[PDB]
Amino acid sequence: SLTLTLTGTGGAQGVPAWGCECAACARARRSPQYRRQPCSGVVKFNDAITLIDAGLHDLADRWSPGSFQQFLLTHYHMDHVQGLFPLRWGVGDPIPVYGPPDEQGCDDLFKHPGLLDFSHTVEPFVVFDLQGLQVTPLPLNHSKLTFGYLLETAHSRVAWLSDTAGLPEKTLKFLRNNQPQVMVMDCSHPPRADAPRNHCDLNTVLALNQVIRSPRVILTHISHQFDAWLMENALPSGFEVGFDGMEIGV
Amino acid sequence: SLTLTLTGTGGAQGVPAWGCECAACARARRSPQYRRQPCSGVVKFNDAITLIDAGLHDLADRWSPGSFQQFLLTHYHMDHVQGLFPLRWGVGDPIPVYGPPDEQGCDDLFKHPGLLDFSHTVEPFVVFDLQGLQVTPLPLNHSKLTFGYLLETAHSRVAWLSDTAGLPEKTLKFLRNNQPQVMVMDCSHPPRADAPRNHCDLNTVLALNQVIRSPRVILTHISHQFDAWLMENALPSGFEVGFDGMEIG
Ligand SMILES: [Mn+2]
Ligand SMILES: [Mn+2]
Ligand SMILES: [Mn+2]
Ligand SMILES: [Mn+2]
Ligand SMILES: [Zn+2]
Ligand SMILES: [Zn+2]
């Protein structure tokens, strides 16, 4: 059993954006299911649990020390690690934190890590094992050193690709050659005439999947402007928008 | 009219500390009214609202843009500013942020401030005015550049002093000479010998008030160990422990 739950599907600004009265933000206030907390996921493989990123601010209420096996981080932007701060001073055994070899980290996490063990840095395209789950780091195109991950068990493959703007060539080629059955993909922006710098727009994602050919692409890291667009425009077949609490099977 | 609310009365670790099952933490799990969120406050002077620090994670739910007048920051440790991150990308007019002239800030706040305006730096012992409220920055003893504040109206004087270990001489003397009727004070630890380095213990706060003689000292920034101690020991007359949500008029 490999499942993935999207615990947050937004960016740093979130939905609702603070004070915004656009159609998407008003909807999320009225109907909480449309709120989007910071982009993050929970992988359950057999008994083992991996927390992909740590942008939620209530992890300490969702989990106890030892109730999950490790963190897997994409990068050290605040919206992906701010949730580690209420955890580090906890009581319990060390908690492994797997992620890119970013030498600075975020604020004083590295200098004062508490129960978090950041020594578990990983390498592009070098597979590691999480309680049987095969994980491959994939370099992404972003303003910080950022890895996405291929997660594989028994030839079932899921790709976690946030945050990124149009994939590096080696990563694109690897994904084409290791076709994911499901790809969770940063698509912050509605379709644009130009590819944005740090996060994909819809047109970029469509272009990428013409090469990768994943049969199920789930868009995440959704901005309020993209939600507004989605309220009036349909996605093409094969693409769906993620939402907080979405459960993904294989 | 002047009201002060202690919206958070804990430190970075909080109460309950994650995974801790000591008497204080277990109590705070059974009864959330004993939880302590990061040290922060709200000052209301007539209609004007100042948010002191921004350690709470849900300011975006408590407030809308324009519903308060400014932030007043003591220092840029993460547990005092982490709540600004969910706000900066909002929709609204610029929000003044008053605070010490820390050149670095925290993470990328200064480079990418969004609606936050960090240009409102303040100076030790130089009074400034917030909608009629007279505010004096007071240097504190802490690992980052940190100011506490005297808040003064025609008849009332309240000091907000966190985070700090002891007080620098000029600040101590200023407080003795401008005796606060209420002093909200960092007291992270139960009575110790000696120090501590970055946050007061109870013996240090007692020593400071031997000089300042404020008639009402409210302890904040309380660690779980100090809470556990308080479950079994009384404080002297004139000292009380803050709680999240406590209102002071
Ligand atoms: Mn990022
Ligand atoms: Mn992001
Ligand atoms: Mn503090
Ligand atoms: Mn501090
Ligand atoms: Zn909006
Ligand atoms: Zn405890």
Strand order in the sheet with B70-72: B116-121, B95-99, B70-72, B48-52, B40-45, B2-8, B246-248
What residues of chain B lie within 8 A of the CB of A82, using their CB?
A: 82, 85
- Disruptive mutation site among A91, A112, A143, A225 for chain B (greatest number of B CBs within 10 Å): A91
A121: left (phi over 0), alpha (psi -120 to 50) or beta: beta
* C-alpha distances out from residue A36 to A40, A218, B60, B113, Å: 10, 15, 14, 22
**Method used to solve the structure:** X-ray
B14 touches A90 (CB < 8 A): no
In whole angstroms, give the CA distance from residue B7 to residue B17: 18
Distance CA A24, CA B29 (A): 36
Cβ–Cβ under 8 Å, residues A87 and A59: yes
* Strand arrangement of the beta sheet that strand A147-153 belongs to: A128-130, A133-139, A147-153, A156-161, A182-186, A217-220, A239-241
Residue B48 has a CB neighbour count (10 Å cut-off) of: 14
- Computed from CA positions of residues A86, A88, A94, A99, in that sequence, does the dihedral angle turn out positive or negative? positive
Q: Specify the residue for token string 């130009």.
A: A194
CATH architecture of the domain with residue range A1-250: 4-Layer Sandwich (3.60)
Distance CA B79, CA A84 (A): 12
Q: Where are the domains of chain B?
A: 1-249
Closest by Cα among B215, B183, B214 to B41: B183
Q: Binding residue per annotation — B107? A: no
**Sheet of A40-45, strand order:** A116-121, A95-99, A70-72, A48-52, A40-45, A2-8, A246-248
- Are the Cβ atoms of B18 and A89 closer than 8 angstroms? yes
Q: Kindly give the interhelix angle for A169-177 and A202-212, rounded to the nearest 10 degrees.
A: 50
Rounded distance between C-alpha atoms, residue A77 and residue A87, angstroms: 17
Gap between the Cα atoms of A214 and A208, Å rounded? 10
CB atoms within 10 A of CB A130: 19
B236 DSSP assignment:
P
- Chain B residues in contact with A21 (beta carbon < 8 A): 91
> Cα(B162) to centroid of ligand 3, in Å?
7
Q: Per DSSP, what are the bridge partners of residue B189?
A: B201
Q: What span, in angstroms and rounded, lies between the C-alpha atoms of B138 and B151?
A: 11
C-alpha Rg value of chain A to the nearest Å: 17
Q: What letter does residue A189 receive in the DSSP assignment?
A: B
B89 neighbourhood in chain A, CB within 8 Å: 12-14, 17-18
The token pair that represents A82 in the structure block: 């701010």
A165: Cβ contacts below 8 Å, ≥ 6 apart: A141, A142, A186, A195, A196, A197, A198, A199, A200, A204
CA proximity to A130, closest of A120, A118, A145, A115? A120
Buried b (16+ CB within 10 A) or exposed e, B180-216: bebbbbbbbbbeeeeeeebbbbbbbbbebbeebebee
C-alpha atoms less than 13 angstroms from C-alpha of A235 in its C-beta half-sphere? 22
Best of B39, B89, B198, B199 to disrupt the A interface by mutation (most A CBs within 10 Å)? B89
Helix and strand totals (H; E) in chain B:
6, 14
The second-level CATH assignment, the architecture, of B1-249 is 4-Layer Sandwich (3.60)
